[PDB]
Design a protein around this nucleic acid. Structure first.
Lengths: 111, 115, 183, 170, 198, 244
RNA sequence: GUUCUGGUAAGCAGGACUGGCGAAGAGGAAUGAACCUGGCACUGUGCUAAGGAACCCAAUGUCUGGACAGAGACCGAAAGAGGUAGGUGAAUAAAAUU
């Protein structure tokens, strides 16, 4: 079963993170950008080393497309969180989900 | 219990190396001589500083009833000579790390059969 | 703010004391007593044949608690070398009060107070025992713990007074006459 | 943080240097602009020269040495404005500089009397020996007779959750 | 992350401070189990706590009490309602989040073996001064009609038995293995397996 | 504005909402405190209401302070109710365990032979059955399942209760062919003693004389007479309004 | 907002000066015509204001003093004692005290 293999392949090679919010103020949301936390990264200086890296959301139960790709654009706040952009806008139903950080840089056009 | 008095040996918050108290100012502040090391190329530096007591942890005592700055630098470099920033497994190259891993992993396979 | 506060109590020849945490326990001729000081912020230890309390950098109302702690420890030591006593005396202008001791000195009954026909029953707290005095109107209480002894005596005194009568004409009662250490 | 400056200045009219006097003023302030402000304030109250007739010729910072961070005793004479009137007083402090002494007073009065730093005025700062000390507070620390243990616990790690069996504090 | 679980021992933590940290995790997809809810600590005298709770019982719906507030009387359920109101519970996202939480008085038998976490920033001895009073939630709730105190004392005695047995059972294996591995019979086979992997 | 004169409320709010009971047969829901200091005994029973009559009794009750010399004796007429109580038969037992959510049942164990009257409660319509109800259970006696069951009850239980049914066939006027079943608690002794006492008595008949005696005080639980839908004047006792 | 006249006053009646709402959206004071920031065609990337930074809810921590009242963060007078932190001026002193 290909899904079980594709997971183990990704698990061995990537860092792990979770999606927790869109970019927002107290009143309005900006769904083009999403906010991520990475496992053991806990300062803004530590987080700067990931700016530019590729990210992937893998979803095996999906009928349309099994994974969405994206890129980390900027650091956010002072405790090591980041801001990222994806080829499609993330649904509110997909918040709380697991994200993979891929250890190589890509250009803003590739996504 | 230890006491904060001239010659107490202290560590600072989230730090591995020892430092030493030189004078007591008030019921909450002290003057310390502080040791630290640049991981960029083993460059050490020792200097004096004023600090609040809520950032330090006592661990022991020495004399220094009378000494000069250059003497206490000597005391400090001896004291923390053995210590290190990080476990070597994270510093070495890939093949060396794997070689070290194998030893542990094989030893378990022996123990689980021998027990 | 006080820089340093210390208080000390000396352990006599026959006595033995231990400190587990903030519980302090005492043993000696008359028996054993213990008390827990976990509700006070203080440092207690035993050093060179003394019991020592200490604090640093404390407020005015914290040092009052340290001192109070030290006086309670002394009462425990004293009470262990000899117990304490309290003396009670019945007083009456017309109706003679009468007393019964029951349950080996653990229960006291009072009868005929101001001519009342119903009885009153009082129970002894902790180690305390009740005994007959020099004439029929006197009672004596004896025990190890100054707290337990004095609390018992107080409860008797506080209940055996007139109610809804003018106390400067009706002067009957049971009163605490004498208190001290036993010889 | 607080710094020490010394400001110099002269009078001018429709023409230059109208008096041959020069006036000086030592001040503790955070920056040069707060220093220059004080110079204007004192001139207008002790003399009657308003800014349009003044020129500042020099501003200098004053700095000590104290390479070994040696601890010294200082006495300070001050006043402050309350709701009632102006209140004078004297207090004693310990530190590694005159500025270290002065920053501790400003903090003290703000804590004890609810006053913003701009309503406090320093009159005199003097360095003292052990025989000179007047009030009770610092004398024990000056005579070198103090030790005490730690009351505050300190965290071992930056992690939010840790295993029950680990060591938690210091 | 969805699919992660965590077990928390509630003893010695200040109630309102732990609750904030827990609520953030529930919103990030973690499943949380709290154990020992009867040992959480509140600051101040118990006298003040009693008055704050009396003012709460007085609140009710004027025209129909079966709509009005429900006043819960178990330590587990009380701490549950403290966490509930630090989440967006009037909306679906909060209702999903709440169903990831379980709270127990004592420790149940299915959770004796599992390793347990703690939150150093919220422990009383870090976050408060020593010179002031405090009380436990188990001490307040007996005054407002909780009826299962004794059941929890019996549970607490089973835990102590399991702790001593497991520690005794561990220390023997530690001794056994450490004394074993110094032997030649062990150190020989290291070579015998390595001959076939070098 | 405040009302003109004071008066009490009409009816008690201790019984609101006043809804209809679910079925006609009551469970004893609360039992008196156990005491290990006494022998094993039962705490309840079932009865049927027959009717009323009156009696005359002698009495000598007066104030202790009444100064009258003579030992006065006086007749009093009193109304009384008669209840019929045929012996109940024991047919099983239940053990319970204490939890943070109250008492919960662990297991139930039944006698080897059960009566037609009790099996009739288990089906809905009496005259239409294949009667294959408990026919496979007796094997559990041969297999030792019963002996394993008693072990579990004896090992882990806080409260023990027996199951008993009533012999309806003795009271023909009821027109009833299904027995009534009640769960009754045992007080006195330890769990082991309680279980042994029960085991000795499965299938046997306990007379009412085991449970109660003359002059005893008892509590009676029942469902009242029905009266249909009714207005406020009768349901709560409110006054009738002005005639015009 | 700053000021004035009549009235015990009033979300009361009536004038003067400089900006508003009327005819003004957006972000902030939980909510509010008029208050704070600041004037609007339509898109994209960066930065700041006012106001925030345990959790609801995007971003939070540190240092030094006070304070124990179901207090305060939101909140009433003349009159006062008690507890505690500091200033100044009088004494006395065989630790200090008033």
């Amino acid at each position: 079963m290909e899904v079980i293999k594709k997971i183990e392949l990704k698990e061995r090679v990537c860092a792990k993170g979770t999606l927790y919010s869109h970019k927002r103020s107290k009143k309005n949301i900006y769904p083009r950008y999403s906010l991520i936390t990475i496992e053991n990264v806990k300062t803004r200086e530590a987080a700067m080393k990931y700016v530019g890296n590729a990210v992937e959301l893998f979803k095996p139960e999906s009928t349309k497309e099994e994974s969405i790709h994206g890129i980390i654009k900027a650091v956010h706040g002072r405790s090591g969180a980041v801001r990222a952009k994806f080829s499609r806008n993330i649904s509110p139903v997909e918040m709380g989900s697991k994200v993979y950080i891929k250890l190589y840089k890509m250009n803003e056009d590739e996504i | 219990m230890y006491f904060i008095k001239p010659g107490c040996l202290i560590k600072k918050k989230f730090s591995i190396y020892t430092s030493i108290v030189i004078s007591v100012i008030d019921n909450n502040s002290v003057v310390i001589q502080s040791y630290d090391k640049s991981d960029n190329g083993d460059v050490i530096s020792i200097d004096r500083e004023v600090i609040n007591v809520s950032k330090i942890v006592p661990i022991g005592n020495i004399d220094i009833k009378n000494k000069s700055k250059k003497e206490i630098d000597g005391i400090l470099v001896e004291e923390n000579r053995n210590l290190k920033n990080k476990d070597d497994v994270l510093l070495m190259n890939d093949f060396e790390r794997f070689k070290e891993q194998l030893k542990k992993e094989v030893e378990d396979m022996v123990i689980e059969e021998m027990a | 703010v006080y820089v340093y506060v210390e208080e000390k109590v000396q352990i006599p020849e026959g006595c033995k004391v231990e400190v587990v945490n903030k519980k302090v326990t005492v043993t000696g001729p008359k028996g054993t007593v213990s008390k827990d000081f976990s509700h006070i912020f203080v440092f207690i230890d035993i050093h060179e044949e003394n019991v020592r309390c200490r604090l640093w950098n404390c407020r005015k109302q914290e040092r009052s608690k340290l001192i109070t702690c030290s006086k309670l420890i002394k009462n425990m030591i004293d009470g262990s070398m000899s117990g304490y006593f309290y003396e009670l005396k019945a007083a009456y202008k017309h109706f003679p009060i009468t007393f019964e001791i029951k349950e080996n000195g653990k229960l006291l009954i009072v009868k005929n107070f101001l001519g009342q026909k119903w009885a009153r029953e009082f129970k002894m707290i902790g180690d305390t025992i009740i005994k007959q005095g020099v004439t029929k109107d006197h009672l004596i209480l004896e025990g190890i713990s100054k707290e337990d002894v004095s609390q018992t005596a107080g409860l008797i005194q506080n209940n055996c007074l007139p109610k809804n009568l003018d106390r400067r004409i009706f002067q009957d009662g049971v009163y605490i006459a004498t208190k001290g250490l036993i010889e | 943080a607080i710094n020490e400056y010394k400001v110099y200045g002269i009078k001018i009219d429709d023409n230059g240097v109208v008096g041959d006097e020069v006036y000086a003023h030592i001040v503790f302030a955070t920056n040069e602009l707060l220093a220059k402000s004080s110079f204007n304030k004192i001139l207008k109250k002790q003399k009657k020269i308003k800014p349009k007739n003044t020129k500042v010729i020099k501003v200098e910072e004053i700095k000590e040495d104290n390479k070994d961070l040696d601890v010294k005793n200082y006495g300070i004479d001050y006043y402050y404005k309350s709701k009632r009137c102006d209140h004078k007083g004297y207090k004693e402090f310990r530190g590694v500089s005159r500025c270290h002494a002065v920053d501790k007073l400003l903090c003290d009065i703000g804590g004890r009397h609810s006053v913003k730093r701009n309503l406090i005025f320093i009159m005199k700062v003097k360095e003292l020996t052990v025989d000179e000390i007047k009030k009770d507070k610092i004398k024990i620390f000056a005579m070198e007779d103090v030790e005490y243990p730690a009351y505050r616990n300190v965290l071992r790690s930056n992690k939010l959750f840790v295993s029950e069996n680990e060591k938690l504090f210091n | 992350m969805i699919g992660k679980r965590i077990v928390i021992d509630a003893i010695g933590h200040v109630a309102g401070k732990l609750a904030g940290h827990i609520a953030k995790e529930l919103m990030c997809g973690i499943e949380v189990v709290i154990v020992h809810a009867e040992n959480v600590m509140f600051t101040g005298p118990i006298k003040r706590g009693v008055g704050k709770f009396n003012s709460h019982l007085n609140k009710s719906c004027s025209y129909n009490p079966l709509r009005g507030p429900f006043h819960l009387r178990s330590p587990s359920m009380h701490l549950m309602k403290v966490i509930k109101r630090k989440l967006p519970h009037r909306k679906s996202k909060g209702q999903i989040a709440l169903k990831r939480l379980q709270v127990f008085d004592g420790c149940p038998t299915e959770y004796l073996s599992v390793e347990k976490m703690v939150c150093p920033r919220d422990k009383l001895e870090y976050t408060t001064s020593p010179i002031r009073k405090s009380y436990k939630l188990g001490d307040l709730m007996i005054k407002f009609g909780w009826k299962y105190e004794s059941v929890v004392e019996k549970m607490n005695q089973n835990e102590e038995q399991f702790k001593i047995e497991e520690t005794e059972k561990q220390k023997v294996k530690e001794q056994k293995i450490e004394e074993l591995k110094k032997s030649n019979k062990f150190q020989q086979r290291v070579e015998e397996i390595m001959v076939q992997m070098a | 504005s405040c009302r003109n004169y004071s008066a009490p409320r009409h009816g008690s709010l201790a019984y609101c909402p006043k809804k209809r009971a679910k079925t006609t047969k009551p469970a004893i829901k609360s039992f008196p405190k156990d005491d290990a200091s006494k022998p094993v005994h039962l705490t309840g029973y079932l009865a049927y209401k027959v009717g009323m009559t009156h009696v005359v009794r002698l009495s000598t009750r007066r104030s202790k302070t009444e100064r009258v010399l003579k030992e006065t004796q006086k007749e009093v007429l009193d109304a009384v109710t008669i209840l019929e109580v045929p012996a109940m038969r024991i047919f099983g037992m239940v053990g319970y365990k204490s939890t943070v959510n109250g008492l919960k049942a662990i297991k139930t164990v039944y006698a080897e032979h059960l009566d037609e009257q009790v099996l009739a409660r288990l089906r809905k319509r009496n005259s239409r059955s294949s009667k294959l109800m408990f026919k496979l259970y007796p094997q559990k006696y041969e297999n030792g399942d019963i002996k394993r069951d008693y072990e579990l009850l004896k090992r882990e239980s806080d409260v023990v209760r027996v199951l008993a049914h009533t012999q309806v066939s003795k009271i023909p006027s009821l027109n009833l062919k299904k027995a009534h079943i009640l769960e009754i608690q045992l007080n006195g002794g330890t769990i082991e003693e309680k279980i042994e006492w029960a085991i000795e008595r499965l299938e046997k008949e306990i007379p009412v004389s085991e449970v109660f005696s003359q002059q005893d005080l008892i509590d009676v639980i029942g469902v009242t007479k029905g009266k249909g839908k009714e207005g406020t004047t009768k349901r709560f006792g409110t006054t009738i309004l002005q005639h015009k």
